[PDB]
Structure formats: C-alpha cells, structure tokens
Amino acid sequence: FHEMREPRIEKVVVHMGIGHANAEDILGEITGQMPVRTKAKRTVGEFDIREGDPIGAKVTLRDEMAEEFLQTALPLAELATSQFDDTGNFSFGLDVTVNLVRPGYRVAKRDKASRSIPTKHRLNPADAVAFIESTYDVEV
C-alpha cells in the first residue's frame, strides 16, 4: 500500500529559452546526455518571422541521470511554497523542472488501454514538498 504510493522522480527537464544556440554545450556538460533544439509558433514582433527555427534547447533527465543532477542542482536554489505545481511539480532557477508522480504513472503514458490517473492517486503539493524535503534540504 505505502510502497506503491511513495513518490518518485518522473523527469528533470533542464531548458534555456533564448530566442535565437551556442548554449547547447553547457547543458550537455552539466546534465551528461545529449540536448535538443526548441522551435516556436506564431510570428512575433520581437524579430520572430521564421516560424520553425531554433530559439532554445532542453534535456529530459530520467533515472540516475536525473538524481545525479538534482544532488548538484537543488543546493543552488532556495525552494519556496508557491514554487509548486497544484499537481505536485516545481520549477526553479536556465530553468530546471522536476516532474513528480506515484508508481503507476505508465497507465497514462502507454499506448494500449491508457487511462488518466485518478485525482486520489495524483500527487499533492504537500506530498510533493515532504518527499523532496525528506531528501537533503529545507522547504518554504
């Protein structure tokens, strides 16, 4: 019961929303794996006439690659209360977002007979803080 309910890190997405690159090199070295470009939609007056074109990049970290990053990433930002998604996620920082969820998430990500996670099984801001706080730092 309690084991199949205790949270885990789904993914850690580190991204840099520039606007026009040379920044791929830093993310690659700080995360470990290979990064990916980021395009945009809708023409903007801030010199964005080319729809599909590089603006930024991101990296989705999973498993160890994610934890080994968080250990040397969390000690760099003062986490707050408001800095938490109603779902149970948080973004701080070069942005760094941590997606958290319970053991049976695959049900909503798979192809065959997928189903959305019930609100009860959906993580909570409180349950989120606790789990994280219970791992090398303080809250609020």
Partner 1 sequence: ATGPRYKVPMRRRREARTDYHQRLRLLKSGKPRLVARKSNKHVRAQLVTLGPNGDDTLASAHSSDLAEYGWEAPTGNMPSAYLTGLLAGLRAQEAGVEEAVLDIGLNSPTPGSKVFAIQEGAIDAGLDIPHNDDVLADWQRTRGAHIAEYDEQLEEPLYSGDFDAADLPEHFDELRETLLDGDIEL
Ramachandran class of 31: left when φ > 0, alpha when ψ lies in -120 to 50, beta otherwise: alpha
Only one of the segments 71-79, 90-98, 100-108, 124-132 lies at the binding site for RNA (rule: CB under 7 A); that segment is 100-108
The yes or no reply on residue 105 touching RNA (CB under 7 A) is yes
d(CA 29, CA 72): 13
Which residues 115-134 are close enough to bind partner 1 by CB under 8 A? Answer: 115
Q: Which helix (H) or strand (E) holds 128?
A: helix 125-133
Supply the minimum distance, in Å, between the C-beta of residue 114 and partner 1: 5
Contact between 101 and 12 under an 8 Å Cβ cutoff? The reply is no
Supply the minimum distance, in Å, between the C-beta of residue 42 and RNA: 11
d(CA 54, CA 122): 34
The yes or no reply on residue 38 touching RNA (CB under 7 A) is yes
Binding site for RNA (CB under 7 A): 1, 3-5, 11, 33-39, 52, 58-63, 65, 102-107, 109-113, 115, 117-121
Binding site for partner 1 (CB under 8 A): 111-115
